């Protein structure tokens, strides 16, 4: 097992760069050339492509063809970053991100078939030429640690573990590295959550190993779709008593608990919306947090990373894609999307939220260098 980020160039997602044209246009219409040019810089920053429904499976081969073309032109070894995000009864403790599969409508079997489709796409001759970094199921197993009081979560616990296990077991290839989602310091970093978190990650890996002998993963992904700083420049009161008060400290805090259960303690850390601290009044505010800024750009530089346990800082959640609708009539309306810290109005989860990414650019830290 080696750090897949070393010696590779993570792929820029063209479809995301294209959505940013709307942001560029907004800045140009305001006569704001600096921020338009900064948005152009963002178009060239690698992000993760989310396979958040069955239809999106159809983007994988075009992405692979694009990556193979770029690899052969540039001579760089490309790293394609994907998220698998379609568990049945998905995101059980909120409403914002409910998906297409439901346990009461053959969802477990449908999830398996969805995974099988992805595996086939990742098994082509072109796929063989590439390497993949894959985050598995954000906002899943953390719910088994803290949210079992929520009926949907209690009902989905087995399906989450078995689903992720099937995914792990199905993606054992020399050119794929897997990272299981591990929430963020404000959720699973509290002292009493550390051991059961480590245990459920190991339980899930062991289930995978019952399907595919010797199945492994690279490690964990943390802070996916959240806002926590890597290293805080002002510790917030809501983090007191939690040793995982920034994501660098979450890594330090969780690592020995992973080691205790024989789970690999290697991490990738989302910093795509982490540039601006101090934008929340409570740690559990997650939905479209107003004035979020783009954070530390994707990097493996140990001068910044400062941890042998961290493979890379990455951008997993693509800034500008909504966390959830603020429309109170919507089936997927979640009250968290109208928290005192939320940017309202906001469109459905995953849909483009131009005003939000306008603010991500303005609030970026370090500031974005313009590409004029
Ligand atoms: O933006 C990345 C993903 O974020 C999730 O919160 C949404 O539910 C998905 O629709 C989206 O693809």
From TrEMBL:
Binding site for substrate: 50, 184, 187, 226, 286, 317, 321
Molecular function terms, GO-annotated: hydrolase activity, hydrolyzing O-glycosyl compounds
S-S bonds: 92-153, 287-337
EC number: 3.2.1.-
Gene3D superfamilies per record: 1, 4-beta cellobiohydrolase
Family matches, as Pfam families: Glyco_hydro_6
Coiled coil feature spans: none
Active site: 91, 139 (proton donor), 323 (proton acceptor)
Alphabetized UniProt keyword annotations: Carbohydrate metabolism, Cellulose degradation, Glycosidase, Hydrolase, Polysaccharide degradation, Signal
Listed InterPro entries: Beta_cellobiohydrolase (IPR016288), Beta_cellobiohydrolase_sf (IPR036434), Glyco_hydro_6_CS (IPR001524)
Top-level lineage group: Eukaryota
GO biological process, one term: cellulose catabolic process
Family: Belongs to the glycosyl hydrolase family 6.
Name recorded for this polypeptide: Glucanase
Lineage of the species this protein comes from: Eukaryota, Fungi, Dikarya, Basidiomycota, Agaricomycotina
């Amino acid at each position: 097992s080696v750090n897949p980020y070393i010696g590779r160039s993570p792929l820029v997602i063209k479809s995301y760069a294209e959505k940013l044209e709307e942001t560029i246009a907004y800045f140009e219409a305001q006569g704001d050339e600096l921020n338009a040019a900064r948005t152009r810089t963002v178009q060239g920053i690698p992000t993760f492509a989310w396979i958040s429904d069955s239809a999106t499976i159809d983007t994988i081969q075009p992405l692979i063809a694009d990556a193979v073309a770029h690899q052969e032109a540039s001579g760089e070894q490309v790293l394609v970053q994907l998220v698998i995000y379609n568990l049945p009864d998905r995101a059980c403790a909120a409403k914002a991100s409910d998906g297409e599969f439901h346990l009461d409508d053959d969802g477990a079997n449908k999830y398996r078939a969805y995974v099988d489709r992805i595996v086939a796409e990742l098994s082509t001759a072109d796929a063989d030429k590439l390497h993949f970094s894959i985050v598995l199921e954000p906002d899943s197993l953390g719910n088994m640690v803290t949210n079992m009081h929520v009926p949907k979560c209690q009902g989905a616990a087995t399906a989450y573990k078995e689903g992720i296990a099937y995914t792990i077991a199905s993606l054992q290839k020399p050119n794929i590295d897997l990272y299981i989602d591990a929430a963020h310091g404000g959720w699973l970093g509290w002292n009493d959550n550390l051991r059961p978190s480590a245990e459920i990650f190991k339980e899930t890996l062991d289930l995978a190993r019952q399907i595919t002998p010797n199945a492994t993963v690279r490690g964990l992904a943390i802070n996916v779709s959240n806002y926590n700083p890597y290293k805080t420049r002002a510790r917030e009161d809501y983090t007191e008593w939690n040793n995982a008060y920034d994501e660098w400290n979450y890594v330090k805090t969780l690592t020995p608990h992973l080691q205790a259960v024989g789970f690999p303690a290697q991490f990738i850390v989302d910093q795509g919306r982490s540039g601006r601290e101090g934008i929340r009044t409570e740690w559990g505010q997650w939905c479209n947090i107003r004035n979020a800024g783009f954070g530390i750009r994707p990097t493996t530089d140990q001068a910044i990373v400062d941890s042998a346990n961290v493979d890379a800082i990455v951008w997993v959640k693509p800034g500008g894609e909504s966390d959830g609708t603020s429309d109170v009539n919507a089936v997927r309306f979640d009250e968290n999307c109208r928290s005192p810290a939320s940017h309202v109005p906001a469109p459905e989860a995953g849909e483009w939220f131009n005003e939000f990414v306008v603010n991500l650019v303005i609030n970026a830290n370090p500031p974005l260098e313009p590409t004029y």
